[PDB]
Enzyme design. Structure first.
Site, mmCIF file in Angstrom:
data_model
loop_
_atom_site.group_PDB
_atom_site.id
_atom_site.type_symbol
_atom_site.label_atom_id
_atom_site.label_comp_id
_atom_site.label_asym_id
_atom_site.label_seq_id
_atom_site.Cartn_x
_atom_site.Cartn_y
_atom_site.Cartn_z
ATOM 1 N N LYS A 58 0.551 2.399 5.628
ATOM 2 C CA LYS A 58 0.559 2.842 7.020
ATOM 3 C C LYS A 58 1.961 2.719 7.643
ATOM 4 C CE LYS A 58 -0.439 -0.335 9.795
ATOM 5 N NZ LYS A 58 -1.213 -1.453 10.394
ATOM 6 N N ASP A 67 -6.746 12.688 13.940
ATOM 7 C CA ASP A 67 -6.109 11.904 14.999
ATOM 8 C C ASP A 67 -4.549 12.060 14.938
ATOM 9 O OD1 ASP A 67 -8.651 10.503 13.838
ATOM 10 O OD2 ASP A 67 -7.155 9.087 13.122
ATOM 11 N N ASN A 81 -4.053 12.618 3.352
ATOM 12 C CA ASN A 81 -3.166 11.593 3.895
ATOM 13 C C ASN A 81 -3.603 10.200 3.451
ATOM 14 O OD1 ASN A 81 -1.471 10.035 5.498
ATOM 15 N ND2 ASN A 81 -1.264 11.750 6.937
#
Length: 284
Positions: free
Chosen positions: A60, A250, A26
């Site tokens: 992001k 997370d 990612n």
């Protein structure tokens, strides 16, 4: 009919042409973090005859902010790509976000990508068409497969025909996702017999969470990625990390970097006798 075929160098995705691996990780973290993840996929691909496209993202925007580890920023982002690039000269991929930046990005990466969240945004279909690269329409969790011929349409309409359809799962009741293996063809057929691919991290991500009987992670990526492969996908899509990912320990789920090899040996053998299997059908 036969399946349409968007061609990526020596790799050619297609629904009867093996599960190409759009592997990766990612958020683009360390210009060199990558490498553990970049290099590690590359070996295995070859050992098994799996083709390889490395996945990495330069930004992001989704969730926490005011900078909160937002990622590399196009400028510094795009460099890191260019490194591991020839380091082992390989096919990469990146999701743009807001039009403009839809060309620079489209120079280091081989397969640009449009975020599930902006699919019905037009000006990015448009702003990825006034390009002409390989697009990967990431499928929204709220769209019945059958609307995907409506992201594809305007793409071609934008000059761009080189499309791919990545399924991630749909939501199931509040905060949960699911995947109907029957959505694949449905997407396959509305998408000019186009190539369909399974994203299992961003999928399983919430699928595992059905709290009470959850409230705290746990993974079975290969167990669910076998289902997709066992129906007939153009490819698979996964992200890895050693300690699950700063960006995947997370947010979504995450593949254990060193656990990779035998996962694919599963996916290769399972897939194996499916692309083999001579076309059958039971509408009679």
């Amino acid at each position: 009919m036969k399946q349409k075929v968007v061609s990526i160098g020596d790799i050619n995705v297609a629904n009867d042409l093996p599960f190409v691996l759009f592997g990766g990780m990612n958020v683009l973290e360390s210009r060199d973090l990558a490498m553990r993840i970049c290099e590690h996929y590359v070996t295995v691909t070859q050992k098994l005859g799996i083709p390889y496209v490395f996945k990495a993202s330069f930004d992001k925007a989704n969730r926490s902010s005011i900078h909160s580890y937002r990622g590399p920023g196009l400028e510094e982002g795009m460099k890191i790509f260019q490194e591991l690039k020839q380091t082992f000269g390989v096919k990469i991929i990146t999701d743009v976000h807001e039009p403009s930046q839809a060309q620079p990005v489209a120079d280091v990466v081989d397969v640009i990508q449009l975020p599930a969240f902006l699919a019905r945004q037009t000006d990015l279909v448009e702003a990825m068409a006034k390009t002409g690269a390989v697009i990967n329409v990431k499928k929204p969790q709220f769209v019945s497969p059958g609307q995907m011929g409506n992201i594809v349409d305007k793409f071609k309409e934008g000059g761009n025909e080189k499309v791919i359809l990545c399924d991630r799962g749909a939501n199931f009741g509040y905060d949960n996702l699911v995947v109907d293996m029957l959505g694949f063809s449905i997407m396959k057929k509305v998408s000019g017999n186009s190539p369909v691919i399974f994203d299992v991290t961003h999928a399983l991500q919430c699928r595992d969470p059905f709290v009470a009987a959850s409230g705290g992670r746990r993974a079975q990526v290969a167990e669910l990625a076998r289902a997709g492969m066992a129906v007939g996908l153009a490819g698979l899509f996964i992200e890895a990390h050693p300690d699950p990912e700063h960006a995947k320990c997370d947010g979504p789920s995450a593949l254990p970097l060193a656990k990779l090899e035998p996962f694919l040996k599963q996916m290769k053998a399972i897939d194996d006798l499916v692309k083999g299997f001579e076309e059958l059908d039971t509408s009679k």
